[PDB]
Amino acid sequence: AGSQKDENLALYVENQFREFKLSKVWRDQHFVKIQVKDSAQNSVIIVDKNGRLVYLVENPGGYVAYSKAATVTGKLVHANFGTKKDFEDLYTPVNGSIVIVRAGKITFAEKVANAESLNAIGVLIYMDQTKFPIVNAELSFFGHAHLGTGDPYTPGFPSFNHTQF
Amino acid sequence: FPFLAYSGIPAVSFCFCEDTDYPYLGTTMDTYKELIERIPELNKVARAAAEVAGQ
Amino acid sequence: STNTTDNIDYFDISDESNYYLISQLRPHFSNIYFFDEFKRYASYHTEIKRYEDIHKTKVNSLLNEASRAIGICNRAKNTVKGLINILENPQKFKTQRESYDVKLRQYEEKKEAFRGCLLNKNRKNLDQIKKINNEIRDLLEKLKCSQDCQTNVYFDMIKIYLVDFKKMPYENYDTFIKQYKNSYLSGVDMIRKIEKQIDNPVTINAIKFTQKEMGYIIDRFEYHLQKVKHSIDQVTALSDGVKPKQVTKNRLKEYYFNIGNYYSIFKFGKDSLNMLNKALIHKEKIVHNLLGELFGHLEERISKLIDSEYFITESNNIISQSEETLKLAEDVYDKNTKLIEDLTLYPHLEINEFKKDYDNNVEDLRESIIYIQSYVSSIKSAYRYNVLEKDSVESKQKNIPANSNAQKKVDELLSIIDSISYSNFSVAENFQKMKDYYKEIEKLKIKILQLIEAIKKYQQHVEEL
Ligand SMILES: *[C@@H]1O[C@H](CO)[C@@H](O[C@@H]2O[C@H](CO)[C@@H](O)[C@H](O)[C@H]2NC(C)=O)[C@H](O)[C@H]1NC(C)=O
Ligand SMILES: *[C@@H]1O[C@H](CO)[C@@H](O)[C@H](O)[C@H]1NC(C)=O
Ligand SMILES: [Ca+2]
User: What residues does the PA domain cover (chain A)?
Assistant: First the structure.
């Protein structure tokens, strides 16, 4: 959104609605706040207890919208999908520990919402093969993490240029 | 969802969906090549979905 | 092989009021067929005898004078002939010095100069057709029957005229033009995609021009076929039918004049549909024999896109270098793997700050080597997930119709180029991963040598103690 190719496609569609002889064709633009990748990489990287030798797993090509700019260490604990039923079915205590979940059956934002209510620090989301059968194991993806909808930095009122933000 | 729940407009959505959900849907491999590999007859199905929205 | 067009005469022009259409087939108007229908109407009334004397002089003047006037506009047809033939081929434009955008403007000026010739030499004859039509009205005034007029000739002329309707084929023209127009819009959509990859400017201008003329002939085909189907629909719509035993004289004149004009539309339609049918099939075969010069200039573009756009020659070098780095590190531990066993047996009875350095560095060395082997496995896994993609495009380029007739094979080749275009992001990010893991193999490559230096310092200090 907001890229140049979006605006070229919008000029193409807005040309088509003129060429098909619609009764009236109109455009409506407004300014929003999204989140995009930084020029520095974000990584997930195994730390030994010694603090001496440091091993890395991936520089993920895909990112999550509306996350926080941070960096943390700690224990990792598997959770099924991040249902609230899952977190209350677990044996290991959740708090103070990064979690991993599998994508599917719930929006990303409710996974992060439940893992935030149980006081965890980190969330890593992946795709297993059983729910998602594919061949290419080195593949990345995308999701918004905002619970609720709309541009979050203007809730309730619209994001035009009359609000002065 | 914001038409139904926030505004109060009756909203409707539909899909011809296989039992397991579509694998590469928010993905860098979502493209027309692998799409026509999954669905071998895309023209007829798109004809059906446009027919339903026409009704 | 045929690279030229012999018959050009599909050009036509209509009046400013759009009332009359001129054609380059004889009898060059629709109204002569109406007049030949009005002979067969005048044979059934004994009142109108003078039509057979007047209309011979009138329509003989019209046919001789009309064919004369086209004989005046022959000379511009010869120049537009040479201009189509020179502008259309690559060899004739190759022997012609002027540029293509230069010569196409000459094509426009000679084109509407030609159609301007034809209309400007029939301007008088349209007024002539008005005058003869007024004479048909005047002779139809002379009918004796004032108020109760049959309507016995009319219902039968719909029958004999309906036999002339059942003679003509209609279905083949409709199915033909729908299939053909589908192939046309597929072709025009195809050239826009094909003119971005391939170098040559000449053949691509030939194909763009021939698709322009092809579009004109498709338009005239739709027009004349539309008037034929509307004429048949109105006449058979009158064959339900309303059945008066008697009508007014001017009502009867409105009837015979009415469906007589429908005979003029139909009989004027059949030969025009024949000529345009020949035109679309011929121009179609010209376009196919133009794409036959293009596919060989496209195949090398596929065989140039594969090897450079799947990043294979660079990635194989990365895996080769990291492999040689692993053999270097395991070579050094192959060198001193006994020397660790010399430097474990001594110190365990003394001032042990020194094991805190030693088993530190030994665990660092072991876990570093295992880290490098896991790195090599990750990079080769990425490589397999790239070469699977390249192999799949090779399997799509191997299987082709042979047995591909016509232009479908060039659409297969363009679909393979799109099949290399739809898969760029996966290979890009995958190759970026290969770069990352190689960088960190460099970092462990310097770290392992610092470790071996620390092991040597351990050895000489154990020798000191
Ligand atoms: C609407 O608001 C936007 C957001 O500030 C304005 O766009 C910016 O204008 C400033 C100064 O003209 C420049 O930094 C850029 O042109 C815009 N910034 C970005 C990040 O896009 C815009 O000018 C406002 N519209 C009006 C009419 O004032
Ligand atoms: C929260 O996490 C810490 C981790 O050190 C743990 O010791 C503690 O018991 C947890 N809180 C509760 C209430 O269990
Ligand atoms: Ca808002």
Answer: 67-157
- Cβ C422–B28 below 8 Å, yes or no? no
Nearest ligand by distance to the CA of A118: 2
- CA distances to B17, B37, C160, C226, C427 from B33, in Å: 19, 6, 59, 41, 15
Q: What would be the CATH architecture of the domain defined by A41-165?
A: 3-Layer(bba) Sandwich (3.50)
Concatenating the DSSP letter of every residue in A37-80 gives --SS---EEEE-SSSS-EEEEE--S--EET---------EEE-S
d(CA C136, CA C151): 19
Question: In 10 A of CB C407, how many CB atoms?
Answer: 20
> What is the H or E stretch that residue A126 is in?
strand A123-126
What is the sign of the dihedral through the CA atoms of A144, A150, A156 and A159? positive
Smallest CA–CA distance, residue C130 to chain A, in Å, is: 39
Between vectors from CA C207 to CA C204 and to CA C211, what angle results, nearest 5°?
140
CB pairs under 8 A between A and B: 30
Query: Helices C249-291 and C171-194: crossing angle, nearest 10°?
Result: 40
Phi, psi of A46 (to 5 degrees): -75, 130
Q: Does A31 contact ligand 1 (Cβ within 6 A)?
A: yes
CB atoms within 10 A of CB C464: 6
Tell which phi-psi region holds residue A51, choosing left (phi > 0), alpha (psi between -120 and 50) or beta: left
Could you please report the per-residue DSSP string of C180-232?
HHHHHHHHHHHHHHHTTT---SHHHHHHHHHHHHHHHHHHHHHHHHHHHHHHH
Give the neighbor-by-neighbor strand order of the sheet with A123-126: A76-78, A98-102, A123-126
Q: Touching A: which chains, 3+ CB pairs < 8 A?
A: B, C
Taking contacts as CB-CB distances below 8 angstroms, the residues of chain B near A131 are 20
Amino acid residing at C224: H
Q: How far is the CA of C325 from the centre of ligand 2 (A)?
A: 45
How many whole angstroms from A95 Cα to the centroid of ligand 2? 6
* CA angle in degrees (0–180, nearest 5) for C295-C301-C303: 105
Closest CA to C211 of C224, C226, C195, C223: C195
Least Cα distance to A65 among A151, A137, A146 occurs for A146
State the burial class of residue A106 (Cβ atoms within 10 Å of its Cβ: 0-12, 13-18, 19+).
middle
Residue nearest to atom 11 of ligand 2 (CA): A95
Resolution (A): 3.7
Task: Tell me the sheet residues that pair with C40.
Answer: none
Q: How far apart are CA B29 and CA C386, in angstroms?
A: 13
Residue C85 neighbours by CB under 8 Å, 6+ apart: C4, C5, C92
Report whether C241 contacts C314 (CB < 8 A): no
Distance separating alpha carbons of residues C239 and C163, to the nearest angstrom: 13
Joined tokens for residue C155: 């219902």
Give CA–CA dist C21/C12, Å, rounded.
Answer: 8
What stretch of H or E contains C365?
A: helix C355-398
Helix %, strand %, coil % for chain C, to 5? Answer: 75, 0, 25
Cα A133–Cα A139–Cα A142 angle in degrees, nearest 5: 100
Rg (CA), chain B: 15
CA C218 from chain centre, in angstroms, equals 14
Residue to probe by mutation, ligand 1, list A7, A30, A159, A161, most atoms within 8 Å of CB: A161
* Distance (Å, whole) CA C59 – CA C50: 14
Query: What whole-number distance in Å separates Cα of residue B40 and Cα of residue C104?
Result: 44
CA distance C204 to C207: 5
